[PDB]
């Protein structure tokens, strides 16, 4: 989890 599309998903 950081910033971008990574932590949008799960």
């Given at each position: 989890?950081?910033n971008?599309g990574?932590?949008?998903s799960?």
């Amino acid at each position: 989890s950081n910033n971008f599309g990574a932590i949008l998903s799960s």
